[PDB]
Design a binder for these strands. Structure first.
Ligand SMILES: Nc1ncnc2c1ncn2[C@@H]1O[C@H](COP(=O)(O)OP(=O)(O)NP(=O)(O)O)[C@@H](O)[C@H]1O
Ligand SMILES: Nc1ncnc2c1ncn2[C@@H]1O[C@H](COP(=O)(O)OP(=O)(O)NP(=O)(O)O)[C@@H](O)[C@H]1O
Ligand SMILES: [Mg+2]
Ligand SMILES: [Mg+2]
Ligand SMILES: [Zn+2]
Ligand SMILES: [Zn+2]
Lengths: 52, 655, 97, 665, 434
DNA sequence: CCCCCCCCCCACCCCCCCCCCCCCCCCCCCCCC
DNA sequence: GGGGGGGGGGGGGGGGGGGGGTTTTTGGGGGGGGGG
């Protein structure tokens, strides 16, 4: 066969203890897991990001 | 055991892919030689069920057209040696590279010295089975062949682009071998091979070769994007034969390669290693063309003594009655002959029609049908049409920072129809933009230092309600509707549509409508073939000729046939016009004018066009007189209509 | 039609495609504002020709209008025609009142 | 020229089509003349790559996927033919292509080594060619749970059936070939990123060492996959009954397989010594100690707040630093003024064997799943309980002969094999009374001691530091075992006279040279030294006569340089170093030799809050040592202000004042 | 290489000196006659070049950008040989080409035509100012003052990268006193209106001319062009370059007022024909018949249209006052009375004219508009229909639908023959003689 | 209440940097005391 | 048996080369307000 590539796995967490607002962003939380809420005011084109 | 430069493989070996990736398999030279023989065998020995080699006939045609493009149908490759079809889908950049060389070899075999006419052939893949929307493109599509639909939002100019380019090193022996230029990246020369060092470089002057280039922004079609969501888009690149196969605002279906490249601008502004993307086109589609047998079918049915009536009955077949409207639409849709008297005086060929009348009388539906049927069409209801949105507009060009024109509806539909529904709802400043394009068949913008005249060769068909929402047969026309004489005179057929209670007529119409609703219900040899057959069985109940045939017949009659007037009953048309003028002195009546006299001739020419007859017979002229006189008589108030119809009967009931 | 270039901004009857659009105080809507919806009412579309942008747009929408009678009070002695500022082009577009 | 290469690759691709393929009527099906094609490919290996020293066929065969897409299908389906028939019993022919497939697998999996003698093409192609062997290892272990392994044992059973008398030299070779297949499949490991050093390094170094091809992950290659697929194909059962049947042509590869299993796994990992989550909580608390330490080394306000400290020295001069916390703590200010220096002294540098415990990072564990741990530990348990003494006797009865031609790889793998299982059975017996020290009794038969002594002495004399290090490791476990059987009780007295004189001197001189070598070399020297000292004390020709040979400054330099790694050393190793110091300093009272500033700095750095765990037993030992050490240094300085300067330098080897410096009258 | 160039030059010298038809050496005579009136160019008919020696035409058509300079050089040498005594100075002569080869319409020109001689036609929509290009640079090194010179031919150039024997990294500068320059003009040609495809916007090409082809044609004139379809590398896709035409010949259908206001151009035969036409007794009737001959009746309107085309006499008085010479006519009335058709004819027959529709017009779009030049970021003035109609007619069809403040903007230009702009710091009174 | 108007908003030297070359310094090995 | 000297490798510094560095007018659509 042609080598059907390694599958990547997205680990989609959900149902967190609390929801932070956009205003609650504070830089100790860099690198930590949160849940965030707001209203989507605009969106990008879907594009390929070079991963490996 | 075998010469290594001519080692080759079996077809089952080709299905037995054993490189790491498809591209590594296509480029393996034993596999590549086998693939060349495989596609060559396909182009030679694939046949229609008549036994003719399809690609024999297409190559024959290609050379007769001096074309650079060979149309290959993907399904024909899926039908025979399907591994090649899989490779073509999974790895088109390599596979098309081989298939092009094979196509050139095949046509050079079929036409010796075609290398003198074109040194290269491009196989234009068509009928690729699987389609995506621009919203639907993803990473898994990268470098795959894709098929996409959209509207060409913005088309740039046609440019030369380098194809094979030698470079000069300013050190050592200067000339460097020919690099092949792609659609995404400049040639990078990290080092000069001849002195194995960095350096400055220039394009070589001894030889270089160019190909045509054109970018197109392709965007989600406005009805296809879900409401509230924004339209997605991609850049499409057209090369060589494909430039100017489309123009702004046209919906197109594109087959091409979804490719990507590093772009420091995208990364810079987004902060992630995220790449720009394109579709490199390999085919573009806009249905109205025909085969030699289809041409013979038009010639066959044109001989029928009832062909004008069968056409007229076939106009909007699911609308009951209104044979006068169907006649007016037929005449408009075939059109007259546009004329130019020694270049010193040009005359309109298009026939303009106004559908004036009561609510719920299929006027809007007739216009939607004509949008369905005409080879170039545009539709714009009432308040939705601005003056410049109808003729043309000037914009400050966002990338060129200068003024440029944008063609309105009457530019987009040039050599076509324009369809203004709810015409009475327009603002009068919007309405009065129509005049120049509707008679002089041009638009003369002079704004922002732009000064030029565009072509606007449209037959405009418009639908209006009378003043207050309903007609009144005790009032003359000019009091039924707010339209002034200069715009009324330009609509050179008028159809008045009255919704009167009439017991057996309403019985018949209601019967037809309920029959139409069950006949249009969605639930009402392979299954697809059977369903298309059932659709034809349903259609022949109400359409004397097939609608698919009618569209190509209209397009044929429009483009090939130009009926001459001859043996003219000059005295009859003169007496008709003289009497119409005299009786039109009634102050509110339909304002008979010289453009109506020319309208009789346009309508007679359109009827001769319906017969594919290059001469206008007396029957065509008599039907034209009947239409114009009935259109005039029908517009009159009841107080005089009987007397006028009796008076005019000598010209028309003789037919 | 808006700038961002020229492009189309979805109005109420676009947003209720395959849906229900509810227009309160319908009678107070100007005739200029009323006549615009005659296409979406029946042809289930909106067609535009403006500023170099040309389109036809889906408006497959059930419209629910809550008109007042002229003068507020419904006059039971007059026809339904007489109690409203509508006329036959738009009244024939409603399935029922 | 590369025209020859494209001709070669074209030939190999055509051969790849000739082997066979799937049949839609999916099953794999052999090609016509398949045996001839396999023979021709084997011919290509010998004809080109061996005889011309190229590895071009070894590359092309990976390009055209012959191993993964033909040979493993052939072997697995042939295994299915034979195994399905075995319940029910032209196999006589298909057996031949199965054998030739296994021959080709042993070729394509053959352990690659590059040396100065390897050709330019070979050393060029080495790095990428290793990657395809890793793909081969993944596919061999994964495909149908590795049923090809069952095919291999069937090919071996088809000579084990015929008697020890019956098996011809070809049958003996076939069995040895199957062992080479198992050895190779264990042995493949990712290659080393071999950088060119002609051109200087840029402003950023190498981006990553990762060499795995994109369809491989290190978990595919990990021992968990090997143990799982070997258990599910009963490879362990085959090996156990094979060593049970040893009653010797194949003994070297069987030894080599056990080496290749053991070479990088730590014995204590196989013993415990919510539980995983509880231990995760323990780990999080341990790093939280580091958090509360680095917090005190962090500004309480933003970096631009930037108040300036000035340190006035004891003299009339001033230094300046910006450390916001340092304003209230001169300790921080001093060590920051030290760290501020742009200067660093320049530092110095410093193959035919695999990575192992000989050269791994000192804490590099293998993370078994519990089932794989159980399967592996029970397998090696049954091996000790059956195969150890006979296999070691077999190979050592060989290796007493032919020592002159024992290639370096063979030497190091043998010493490591001995050491690993001796250490393991000692640990299992210290855990379970049911496990017997005498189940590794062959270690103590004097032939074995003589051979290991010969290997160590020769490697030291020959300055082969690799085998020297391995023999040192083997000596450590031999002495460990000897001390145990001294307690368990004649052979202990015998070896305790045989390691006199020249062996005392040699063992004393390893840690004199060890300071120049890698951390693991030094660690093995320290471990050997502690084992030697406890053995000689258990005996206690004269004790002072031996230990004086160790107590000298080059040995102390090895000890200090080993102890510089204290953050990365294990607590038991720090305990061992400080027990050596305890003897040398407190008991033997050569305390002058340790009054040197390298130790003073090292003591502070580990006793600092940024050093050892507050609750560590080794911290307790360093604190206990340091109080006494400081007291003795205070005494010597009070008795000698000259030693304030003597603290900075090596002590004076001019004995006429050196004795006075050492003792001070 | 220069041996072959010498042979090419000698071949062209022989073409000038030897080509003869019916006893006249037409190119020797034309070159001399041009030299006397001091225009240093030669107009060559490529039929004659083909007829002389088709190998020469093969060399020229294979690579005109290398061969045209050699032909120009040959013309200089013959010019000296026939106008300066040998052993008792002129610039490099421009070569102008006349051709009857098959035209390529502007939209069909593409990559296969790059560097080929091309013939086409269109309407000039714009004409830029006369930029200056070097024919000959005097050059010297900034450090060691090594002095040299570079002769330049304008067919696609640079200074040298480093000195011709340290002088630093980029060492050469121009000496403008001994350098020589020529006029270069840019024209924008738009394709012929009746050749535009269905529904397409009309496409246009930027193109350049120099020496005596500058100022030969003006906006609105319909022209046929001979030139080298060629490329330049703009400062802006990838590997994509802007096409243009290096003009080698211009032939307008007629020449009118290109750079002339009091000067004229008429042949003796056409002047005599006009003189005896002027003397005809039925002249006014014949001219009236000529106006819109397919339009019936409307005789007084046709008579008035003749008067509007001819105009009166403009006058300027010692008062300083100016009296309006041109004539304005309004056709007001019923539908289908052929008013628009009459305006179309007048725009067709008038030597200068513009047609616009009132609803298609603007105040600025009619008189003149302010624009901002983008890379200069600076305001300039661009002409509307009144400026382009200057010296002729503006046909304002659909006039009653013109917005009133657009309509009011016509007043001054319609009576005082001027457009008084005061906008963005521009203040001018442009002329509009319409 | 309807239509039209009109108002608003919008489009050549100098520094940083990188590469190359040369010399010096530090370590290791061998010889001499 | 240790110290000095010679020789080789590796690192650092210095020099040289190279490349980069907003209001004003015009047109269009939409919204708001005023007059008949
Ligand atoms: N003769 C007919 N046959 C079939 N359907 C008809 C007929 N007359 C009217 N209808 C139906 O009436 C509906 C409205 O048609 P439509 O085209 O909007 O009428 P209209 O003439 O445009 N009225 P209006 O928009 O108020 O001016 C459609 O669904 C038609 O199917
Ligand atoms: N006297 C005439 N002789 C010949 N053709 C005529 C005459 N009068 C009108 N026509 C024709 O009728 C049309 C006249 O259109 P047009 O020139 O626009 O008239 P108009 O006066 O401009 N009407 P309008 O634009 O509505 O004010 C053309 O098709 C002419 O061929
Ligand atoms: Mg309608
Ligand atoms: Mg007109
Ligand atoms: Zn070079
Ligand atoms: Zn110089």
């Amino acid at each position: 066969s042609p080598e059907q590539t390694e599958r990547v796995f997205q680990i989609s967490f959900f149902n967190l203890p609390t929801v932070h607002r956009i205003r609650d962003i504070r830089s100790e939380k860099i690198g930590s897991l949160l849940s965030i809420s707001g209203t989507v005011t605009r969106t990008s084109e879907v594009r390929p990001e070079l991963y490996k | 055991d075998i010469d290594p430069l001519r080692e080759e493989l079996t077809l089952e070996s080709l299905s037995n892919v054993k490189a790491n990736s498809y591209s590594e398999w296509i480029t393996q030279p034993n596999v590549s030689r086998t693939i060349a023989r495989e596609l060559k065998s396909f182009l030679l020995e694939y046949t229609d069920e008549t036994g003719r080699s399809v690609y024999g006939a297409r190559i024959r045609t290609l050379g007769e057209m001096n074309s650079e493009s060979l149309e290959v149908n993907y399904r024909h490759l899926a039908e025979s040696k399907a591994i090649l079809a899989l490779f073509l889908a999974k790895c088109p950049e390599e596979m098309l590279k081989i298939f092009d060389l094979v196509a050139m070899e095949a046509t050079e075999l079929h036409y010796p010295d075609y290398a003198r006419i074109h040194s290269e052939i491009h196989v234009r893949i068509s009928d690729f089975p699987t389609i995506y929307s621009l919203r639907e493109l993803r990473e898994s599509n990268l470098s795959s062949l894709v098929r996409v639909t959209g509207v060409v939002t913005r088309r740039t100019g046609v440019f030369p682009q380098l194809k094979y380019v030698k470079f000069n090193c300013l050190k050592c022996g200067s000339i460097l071998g020919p690099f092949f230029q792609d659609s995404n990246e400049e040639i990078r020369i990290s080092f000069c091979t001849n002195c194995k060092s960095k350096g400055p470089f220039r394009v070589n002057g001894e030889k270089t070769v160019y190909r045509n280039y054109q970018r197109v922004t392709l965007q989600e079609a406005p009805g296809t994007v879900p409401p509230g969501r924004l339209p997605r888009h991609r850049e499409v690149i057209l090369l060589a034969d494909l430039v100017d196969v489309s123009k702004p605002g046209e919906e197109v279906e594109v087959t091409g390669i979804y490719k990507n490249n590093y772009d420091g601008n995208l990364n810079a502004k987004n902060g992630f290693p995220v790449f720009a993307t394109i579709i490199e086109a390999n085919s573009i589609k806009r249905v109205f063309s025909w085969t030699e047998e289809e041409e013979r079918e038009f010639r066959k049915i044109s001989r029928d003594r009832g062909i004008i009536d069968k056409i007229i009955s076939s106009m909007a077949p699911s609308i009951y009655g209104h044979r006068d409207i169907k006649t007016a639409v037929a005449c408009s849709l075939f059109g007259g002959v546009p004329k130019n008297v020694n270049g010193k005086h040009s005359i309109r060929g298009d026939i303009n029609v106004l559908l004036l009348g009561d609510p719920g009388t299929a006027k809007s539906q007739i216009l939607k049908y004509v949008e369905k049927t005409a080879h170039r069409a545009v539709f714009a209801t009432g308040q939705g049409a601005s003056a410049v949105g109808l003729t043309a507009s000037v914009r400050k060009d966002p990338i060129t920072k200068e003024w440029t024109l944008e063609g309105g509806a009457l530019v987009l539909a040039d050599k076509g129809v324009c369809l203004i529904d709810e015409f009475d709802k327009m603002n009068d400043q919007d309405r009065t933009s129509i005049h120049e394009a509707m008679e002089q068949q041009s638009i003369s913008i002079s704004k922002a230092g732009i000064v030029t005249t565009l072509q606007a060769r449209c037959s405009i068909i418009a639908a209006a309600n009378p003043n207050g929402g309903r007609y009144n047969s005790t009032l003359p026309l000019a009091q039924n509707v707010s339209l002034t004489e200069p715009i009324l005179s330009r609509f050179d057929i008028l159809c008045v549509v009255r919704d009167l209670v009439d017991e057996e007529a309403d019985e018949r119409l209601a019967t037809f409508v309920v029959d139409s609703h069950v006949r249009s219900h969605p639930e009402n040899l392979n299954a697809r073939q059977r369903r298309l057959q059932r659709q034809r069985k349903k259609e022949e109940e109400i359409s004397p000729i097939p609608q698919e045939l009618l569209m190509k017949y209209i397009h044929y009659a429009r483009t090939k046939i130009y009926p001459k007037l001859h043996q003219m009953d000059m005295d009859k048309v003169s007496r008709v016009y003289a009497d119409l003028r005299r009786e039109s002195i009634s102050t509110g009546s339909f304002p008979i004018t010289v453009r109506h006299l020319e309208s009789i001739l346009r309508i007679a020419e359109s009827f001769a066009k319906m017969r594919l007859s290059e001469f206008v017979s007396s029957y065509d002229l008599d039907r034209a007189i009947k239409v114009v006189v009935d259109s005039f008589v029908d517009a009159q108030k009841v107080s005089v209509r009987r007397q006028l119809r009796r008076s005019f009967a000598i010209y028309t009931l003789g037919h | 039609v808006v700038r961002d270039d020229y492009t189309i901004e979805a109005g109420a009857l676009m947003l209720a495609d395959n849906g229900i659009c509810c227009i309160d105080e319908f009678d107070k809507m100007d005739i200029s504002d009323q006549v615009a919806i005659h296409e979406a009412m029946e042809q289930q579309t909106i067609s535009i020709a403006k500023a170099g942008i040309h389109a036809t747009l889906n408006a497959r929408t059930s419209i629910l209008a809550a008109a007042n009678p002229v003068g507020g009070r419904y006059n039971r002695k007059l026809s339904l025609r007489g109690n409203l500022n509508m006329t036959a082009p738009i009244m024939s577009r409603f399935d029922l009142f | 020229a590369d025209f020859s290469l494209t001709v070669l690759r074209a030939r190999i691709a055509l051969l790849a089509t000739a082997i066979g393929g799937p049949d839609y009527t999916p099953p794999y099906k052999l090609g016509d003349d398949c045996l001839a094609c396999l023979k021709d490919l084997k011919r290509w290996f010998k004809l080109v790559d061996d005889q011309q020293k190229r590895w071009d066929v070894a590359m092309a065969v990976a390009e055209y996927r012959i191993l993964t897409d033909d040979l493993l299908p052939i072997l697995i389906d042939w295994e299915n033919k034979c195994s399905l028939a075995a319940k029910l019993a032209n196999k006589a022919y298909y057996d031949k292509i199965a054998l030739n497939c296994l021959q080709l697998l042993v070729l394509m999996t053959w352990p690659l080594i590059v040396t100065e003698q390897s050709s330019s093409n070979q050393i060029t192609l080495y790095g990428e060619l290793k990657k395809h062997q890793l793909v081969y290892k993944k596919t061999i272990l994964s495909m149908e749970s590795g049923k090809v392994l069952r095919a291999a044992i069937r090919l071996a059973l088809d000579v084990i059936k015929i008697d020890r008398l019956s098996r011809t030299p070809r049958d003996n070779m076939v069995l040895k070939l199957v062992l080479n297949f198992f050895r190779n499949v264990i042995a493949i490991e990712p290659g080393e990123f071999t950088i060119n050093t002609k051109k200087s390094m840029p402003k950023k170094g190498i981006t990553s060492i990762d060499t795995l091809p994109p369809n491989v992950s290190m978990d595919d290659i990990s021992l968990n996959t090997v143990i799982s697929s070997f258990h599910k194909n009963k490879v362990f059962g085959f090996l156990l009954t094979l060593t049970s049947s040893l009653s010797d042509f194949i003994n070297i590869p069987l030894l080599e397989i056990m080496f290749y299993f053991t070479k990088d796994v730590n014995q204590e990992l196989l013993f415990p010594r919510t539980s995983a989550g509880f231990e995760l909580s323990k780990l999080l608390q341990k790093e939280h100690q580091m958090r509360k330490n680095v917090i005190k080394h962090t500004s309480a306000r933003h970096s631009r707040f930037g108040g300036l400290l000035s340190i006035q020295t004891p003299d009339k001069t001033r230094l300046t630093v910006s450390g916001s916390q340092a304003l209230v703590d001169e300790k921080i200010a001093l060590q920051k003024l030290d760290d501020s220096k742009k200067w660093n002294k320049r530092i110095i540098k410093k193959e035919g064997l695999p990575n192992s415990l000989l050269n791994s990072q000192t804490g590099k564990a293998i993370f078994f799943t519990e089932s794989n741990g159980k399967h592996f530990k029970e397998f090696i348990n049954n091996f000790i309980d059956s195969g150890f003494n006979i296999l070691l006797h077999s190979v050592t009865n060989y290796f007493t002969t032919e020592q002159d031609r024992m290639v370096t790889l063979e030497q190091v793998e043998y010493l490591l094999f001995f050491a690993w299982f001796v250490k393991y059975q000692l640990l299992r017996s210290k855990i379970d009374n049911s496990a017997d020290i005498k189940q590794v009794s062959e270690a103590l038969k004097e032939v074995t001691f003589i051979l290991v002594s010969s290997l160590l002495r020769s490697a030291y004399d020959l300055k082969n530091w690799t085998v020297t290090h391995a023999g040192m490791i083997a000596f450590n476990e031999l002495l460990n075992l000897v001390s145990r059987t001294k307690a368990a009780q004649d052979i202990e007295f015998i070896v305790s006279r045989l390691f006199s004189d020249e062996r005392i001197q040699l063992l004393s001189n390893l840690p004199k040279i060890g300071s120049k070598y890698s951390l693991q070399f030094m660690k093995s020297c320290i471990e050997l030294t502690h084992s030697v000292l406890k053995v000689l004390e258990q005996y206690s020709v004269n004790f002072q006569k031996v230990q004086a040979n160790y107590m000298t400054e080059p040995v102390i330099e090895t000890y200090i340089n080993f102890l510089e790694r204290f953050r990365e050393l294990e607590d038991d190793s720090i305990k061992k170093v400080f027990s050596f110091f305890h003897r040398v300093f407190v008991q033997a009272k050569e305390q002058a030799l340790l009054f040197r500033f390298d130790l003073i700095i090292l003591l502070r750095e580990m006793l600092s809050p940024d050093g050892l765990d507050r609750m560590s037993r080794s911290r307790k030992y360093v604190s206990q040592f340091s109080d006494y050490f400081l007291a003795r240094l205070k005494k010597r300085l009070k008795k000698s202000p000259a030693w304030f300067v003597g603290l900075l330098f090596p002590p004076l080897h001019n004995s006429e004042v050196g004795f006075y410096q050492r003792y001070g009258e | 290489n220069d041996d072959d160039n010498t042979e090419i030059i000698k071949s062209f010298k022989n073409f000038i000196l030897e080509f003869r038809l019916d006893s006249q050496f037409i190119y020797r005579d034309q070159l001399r006659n041009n030299i006397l009136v001091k225009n240093y160019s030669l107009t060559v008919n490529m039929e004659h070049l083909i007829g002389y020696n088709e190998d020469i035409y093969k060399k020229l058509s294979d690579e005109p950008s290398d061969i045209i300079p050699l032909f120009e050089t040959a013309i200089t040498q013959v010019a000296k040989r026939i106008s300066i005594l040998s052993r008792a100075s002129l610039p490099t002569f421009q070569l102008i080409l006349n051709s009857n080869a098959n035209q390529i319409p502007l939209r069909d020109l593409d990559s296969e035509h790059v560097s080929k001689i091309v013939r086409l036609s269109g309407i000039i929509i714009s004409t830029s100012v006369l930029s200056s290009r070097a024919t000959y640079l005097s050059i010297m090194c900034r450090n060691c003052r090594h002095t040299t010179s570079i002769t330049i031919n304008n067919f696609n150039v640079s200074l040298p990268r480093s000195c011709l024997s340290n002088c630093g990294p980029d060492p050469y500068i121009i000496i403008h006193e001994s350098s020589k320059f020529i006029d270069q003009q840019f024209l924008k040609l738009q394709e012929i209106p009746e050749l535009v495809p269905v529904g397409e916007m009309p496409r246009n090409l930027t193109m350049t001319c120099d020496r005596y082809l500058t100022n030969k044609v003006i906006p609105g004139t319909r022209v046929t062009i001979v030139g080298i379809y060629s490329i330049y590398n703009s400062k802006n896709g990838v590997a994509i370059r802007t096409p243009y035409i290096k003009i080698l010949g211009i032939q307008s259908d007629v020449e009118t007022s290109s750079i002339w206001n009091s000067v004229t151009m008429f042949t003796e035969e056409e002047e005599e024909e006009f003189l005896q036409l002027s003397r005809n007794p039925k002249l006014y009737e014949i001219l009236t018949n000529s106006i819109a001959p397919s339009i019936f009746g409307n005789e007084d309107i046709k008579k008035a249209i003749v008067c509007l085309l001819m105009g009166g006499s403009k006058k300027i008085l010692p008062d300083g006052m100016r009296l309006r010479g041109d004539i304005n006519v309004l056709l007001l009335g019923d539908p289908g009375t052929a008013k628009s058709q009459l305006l179309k004819f007048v725009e067709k027959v008038s030597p200068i004219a513009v047609y616009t529709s009132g609803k298609g017009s603007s105040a600025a779009g009619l008189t003149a508009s302010v624009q901002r030049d983008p890379m200069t970021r600076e305001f300039y003035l661009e002409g509307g229909a009144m400026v382009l109609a200057d010296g002729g007619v503006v046909c304002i069809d659909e006039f009653d639908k013109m917005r009133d403040e657009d309509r009011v903007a016509i007043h001054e230009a319609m009576e005082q023959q001027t457009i008084s702009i005061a906008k963005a710091g521009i203040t001018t009174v442009l002329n509009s003689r319409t």
